[PDB]
Design an enzyme around this catalytic site. Structure first.
Site, PDB file in Angstrom:
ATOM      1  N   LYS A  58     -45.059  94.322   6.595  1.00  0.00           N
ATOM      2  CA  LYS A  58     -43.788  95.117   6.264  1.00  0.00           C
ATOM      3  C   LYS A  58     -43.643  96.240   7.347  1.00  0.00           C
ATOM      4  CE  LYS A  58     -43.715  92.503   4.011  1.00  0.00           C
ATOM      5  NZ  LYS A  58     -44.326  91.050   3.479  1.00  0.00           N
ATOM      6  N   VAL A 277     -48.993  77.264   6.478  1.00  0.00           N
ATOM      7  CA  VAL A 277     -48.866  76.442   5.617  1.00  0.00           C
ATOM      8  C   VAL A 277     -49.450  76.601   4.207  1.00  0.00           C
ATOM      9  CG1 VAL A 277     -48.695  74.602   7.610  1.00  0.00           C
ATOM     10  CG2 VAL A 277     -50.689  75.223   6.559  1.00  0.00           C
ATOM     11  N   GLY A 278     -49.556  77.794   3.701  1.00  0.00           N
ATOM     12  CA  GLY A 278     -49.989  78.176   2.699  1.00  0.00           C
ATOM     13  C   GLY A 278     -51.561  78.844   2.581  1.00  0.00           C
ATOM     14  N   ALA A 327     -49.080  90.297  -4.958  1.00  0.00           N
ATOM     15  CA  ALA A 327     -49.745  91.581  -5.157  1.00  0.00           C
ATOM     16  C   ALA A 327     -49.896  92.147  -6.606  1.00  0.00           C
ATOM     17  CB  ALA A 327     -49.649  92.503  -4.244  1.00  0.00           C
ATOM     18  N   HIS A 451     -21.352 105.487  -8.304  1.00  0.00           N
ATOM     19  CA  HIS A 451     -20.510 104.990  -7.287  1.00  0.00           C
ATOM     20  C   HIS A 451     -20.373 106.057  -6.236  1.00  0.00           C
ATOM     21  CE1 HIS A 451     -16.800 103.000  -5.422  1.00  0.00           C
ATOM     22  NE2 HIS A 451     -16.569 104.320  -5.310  1.00  0.00           N
TER      23      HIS A 451
END
Ligand SMILES: Cc1cc2nc3c(=O)[nH]c(=O)nc-3n(C[C@H](O)[C@H](O)[C@H](O)COP(=O)(O)OP(=O)(O)OC[C@H]3O[C@@H](n4cnc5c(N)ncnc54)[C@H](O)[C@@H]3O)c2cc1C
Ligand SMILES: Cc1cc2nc3c(=O)[nH]c(=O)nc-3n(C[C@H](O)[C@H](O)[C@H](O)COP(=O)(O)OP(=O)(O)OC[C@H]3O[C@@H](n4cnc5c(N)ncnc54)[C@H](O)[C@@H]3O)c2cc1C
Ligand SMILES: Nc1ncnc2c1ncn2[C@@H]1O[C@H](COP(=O)(O)O)[C@@H](O)[C@H]1O
Ligand SMILES: Nc1ncnc2c1ncn2[C@@H]1O[C@H](COP(=O)(O)O)[C@@H](O)[C@H]1O
Lengths: 475, 475
Positions: A58, A277-278, A327, A451
């Site tokens: 992140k 790939v995992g 997580a 809004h």
């Protein structure tokens, strides 16, 4: 001299460290065993998520996005800059500082809560005894009234492209590049592959994503994956479906990759290659041969809906058991287990665990996809609202994407919320909260949404379910 | 013959135009009267909010924040640029194009739904008859079965600082500067004053905010307003409380302002002065002598909980009636009135209308403040979580602020959610949705929140209510 605990947790990732804190908060004498050490050779808590997973990825995604926005989307606001540049080392250093802060934070939480931290490798023996192999080789056996296995996962390594931590890397190495690879290959178009490829494409890498399957983000709603593929392609990810990597050859500081698609064998050269790939469950030396703990066909510790293994008083949570490898899934399983140890009838609603992909636009969802509901024969009403119609999104100069709400055609109960666009995770969480309370599409439409806010897009989509949206035509 | 409609709406702001669209969707022959037209001769649908309010301010807030961030917060990510400069005319022009697109959007919605838009000044006569005075002075009387008064508001004009839209402007002129004023004064430290002051301070103006009261954002929770004053002061807003403006003298392209504080009279000169001392309801030539519609002591149209006036079949909504002068309040009152005209028993929950301040950090809340609950003798439990402890916020490099959840000490019912920090409005909306369903703090704590997300701060704050937060010590 034999240490005795109410709860012994093996692993200190989001599953294990949260479970340990919760156990301690509930008055249970708790120990948490963890083997991972940082660059200073000191115990480092937080698991994959904190050290080489969610957090570091992140950090790089947010930094790389700011760079891309400064380069391409500042002029529209009237902002001019000189040449935009990226000090890659400084970016990676910021990330390293965040990780250090957060791992220190978990240690602090353990101390404040009275969790006994034990550095070492833990192995469950028969009789709920746990053998701890300490950092210096010393072994010690501790006794537990309850054991929580939270050993996590690791990347899958495949014979066609073995990781060498230099030219061919896994996700850990992908977060440590010192320079932008001129040509970057990524094997696997899953969440991790797309996130990592996005980081480096933003910084100038020519990125090619080789995906063996002929489907893109099959877990996402079809409309969401269609839009995602289109936008990511436009951002420089050359996503090739039906492209199975069959071999590779490292030549100094390059790698020639061979793959097969509808046109036969193809060859392509990259400066760096990320294998994504995992991930596979980790049970390496976790269980004595006579532990009594059952492992399924794919290596996962077998557990019931309450994370209880085949052995009384032994539980397993997180990436090492069935379910989405996330997580928050791990942490909430830890909470459930500890609450149940204390006699509370805690339970988890696996149907309301949201999924998030941190590309830009962000992608998130909770509940069922439209294709899944149609396959199961469930009649539905769908409401959609595009961010192109959102005044808040226009102000932000980020109008791509949409919100999609799916409700049962007979009862109007919301069965799924899918978002691709700004603050997707936050809007999906709004949907998830409402779903926890059994919301109907009408219930959401009847609420007052501030809004101008991105949240209004969820409100409009809910109204659109029954043809009542104000800001988009209804059919 | 006389034009006849089921519903006649006077005013095309968020109350009026939404009320018109909804009436039309429910099969009612509807007309919407609007007096204002833009420079291209187009009807200015969207009222204050779209043309000179919410949207334009958010556009400038977003553009100005990007400028500040590039100058001050890019280095930490490894990003360098040349000199960062703002072309103010281009920034304001982007805003103007957003306004034009959105106003066009409402015209398109009116057309798709069958709403008859009428250019002119509408006046309610006796017998639910509406006189429209056109721009050329001609008049036409239309007949209505239901009238919705949505004439909105306008800035309060004060004798000490008359607006000339050059050196002394109101909020409308403040969104049109063509250059950053070297010295900018703002009269009033309310939402509008703080937002407008922030825009220009970010772009280099030396900003002074003169506020007559000795309180700051008294409607916000005390902890939120304290933090807001601290951070806004650090961002360059010299907020002077107890500083009442008593006079002003324009001297060419400057204005000398005289105000009174703890040291008696003071004088200060500005290049531009923004008068943001509040807003007043507009009923200018809106009602005939014998309309039968009651006006209260402050100029608002008097209405009950369903926005019904003292005259059967006549309703009033938005800024022209009691309540928070907010766009979403106006729109939802519009929806309530129309649904009720159709016979449905719709209702507004005035207790759950959220409030948002679009400064950075963003501020939002819903429900009651801690100080209000204490003053009312309601025993409460408070849970707080700071963004300094959020992994997601750290990755974004935006850790200032916190989430505060307040629950009833006996029932655990959530009574208020207050946020200052990233995505404040979206987190508050999560809280509002939960509160609509009668959530307890425990209910929120038991839900699965995606990790890592800003939403987790709300989850942790909810848990902290009952001393069960995971990521902060519970003391
Ligand atoms: C690049 C990347 C990005 C990701 N991004 C996200 C995201 O954005 N959102 C999300 O929800 N998920 C994300 N994930 C997945 C997330 O990291 C995992 O789902 C999560 O870490 C699982 O937590 P856990 O506690 O089950 O396992 P882990 O976090 O893997 O923790 C297991 C711990 O146990 C230790 N251990 C193992 N065996 C033993 C033993 N025998 N004795 C002692 N210690 C042991 C390990 O050292 C490890 O620290 C990401 C993963 C990767 C790789
Ligand atoms: C700078 C600024 C920023 C703001 N930011 C926000 C924000 O972020 N969020 C938020 O919720 N609110 C915000 N507001 C407040 C918001 O604009 C109002 O609450 C909202 O516009 C009220 O809507 P309305 O329909 O009641 O009235 P208005 O939007 O004022 O619309 C009234 C309309 O009726 C017309 N009219 C008046 N009399 C007549 C007549 N006799 N005949 C025909 N037409 C007539 C007017 O020309 C106008 O178009 C802001 C206001 C300002 C000034
Ligand atoms: N040899 C391979 N070449 C290309 N893609 C592969 C290969 N092996 C696995 N994959 C893909 O890698 C992806 C991993 O996805 P996930 O587990 O979601 O990260 C899947 O979509 C697989 O099809
Ligand atoms: N002459 C004045 N000098 C300074 N502040 C003023 C003056 N008149 C009104 N105000 C302030 O203007 C603010 C308007 O805020 P609000 O109505 O919330 O937008 C209030 O806080 C008033 O105290």
């Amino acid at each position: 001299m034999t240490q005795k605990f109410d709860v012994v947790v093996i692993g200190a990732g989001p599953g294990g460290y949260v479970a340990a804190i919760k156990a301690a908060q509930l008055g249970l004498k708790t120990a948490c065993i963890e083997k991972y050490t940082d660059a200073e050779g000191k115990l480092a808590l937080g698991g994959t998520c904190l050290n080489v997973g969610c957090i570091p990825s992140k950090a790089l995604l947010d930094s790389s996005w700011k760079y891309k926005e400064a380069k391409e989307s500042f002029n529209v606001h009237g902002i001019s800059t000189g040449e935009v540049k990226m000090d890659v080392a400084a970016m990676v250093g910021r990330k390293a500082g965040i990780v250090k802060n957060l791992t220190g934070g978990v240690a602090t939480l353990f101390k404040a809560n009275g969790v006994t931290s034990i550095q070492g490798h833990g192995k469950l023996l028969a009789g709920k005894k746990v053998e701890v192999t300490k950092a210096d080789g010393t072994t010690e056996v501790i006794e537990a009234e309850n054991v929580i296995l939270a050993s996590g996962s690791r990347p899958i390594d495949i014979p066609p492209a073995p990781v060498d931590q230099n030219v061919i890397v896994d996700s850990t190495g992908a977060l440590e590049f010192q320079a932008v690879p001129k040509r970057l290959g990524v094997i696997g178009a899953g969440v991790i592959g797309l996130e990592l490829g996005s980081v480096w494409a933003r910084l100038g890498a020519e990125v090619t994503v080789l995906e063996a399957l002929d489907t893109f983000l099959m877990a996402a709603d079809t409309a969401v994956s269609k839009e995602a593929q289109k936008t990511l392609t436009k951002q420089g990810l050359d996503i090739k479906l039906g492209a199975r990597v069959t071999g590779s050859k490292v030549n100094g500081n390059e790698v020639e990759v061979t793959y097969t698609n509808a046109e036969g064998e193809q060859k392509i050269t990259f400066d760096k290659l990320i294998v994504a790939v995992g991930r596979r469950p980790v049970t390496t030396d976790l269980l004595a041969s006579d532990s009594g703990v059952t492992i399924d066909e794919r290596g996962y510790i077998f557990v019931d809906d309450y994370c209880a293994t085949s052995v009384p008083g032994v539980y397993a949570i997180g990436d090492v058991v069935r379910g989405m490898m996330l997580a928050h899934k791990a942490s909430e399983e830890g909470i459930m287990v500890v609450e149940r140890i204390k006699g509370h009838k805690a339970q988890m609603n696996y149907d309301l665990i949201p999924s998030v992909i941190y590309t830009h636009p962000e992608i998130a969802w909770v509940g069922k996809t439209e294709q899944a509901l149609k396959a199961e024969g469930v009649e539905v009403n769908v409401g959609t609202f595009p961010f192109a119609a959102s005044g808040r999104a226009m102000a932000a100069n980020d109008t791509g994407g949409f919100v999609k709400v799916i409700a049962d055609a007979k009862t109007d109960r919301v069965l799924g919320v899918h978002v691709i666009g700004p603050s997707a995770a936050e809007l999906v969480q709004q949907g998830a909260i409402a779903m926890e309370f059994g919301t109907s599409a009408e219930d959401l439409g009847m609420m007052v949404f501030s809004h101008p806010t991105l949240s209004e897009a969820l409100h409009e989509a809910a109204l659109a379910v029954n043809g009542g949206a104000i800001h988009v035509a209804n059919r």
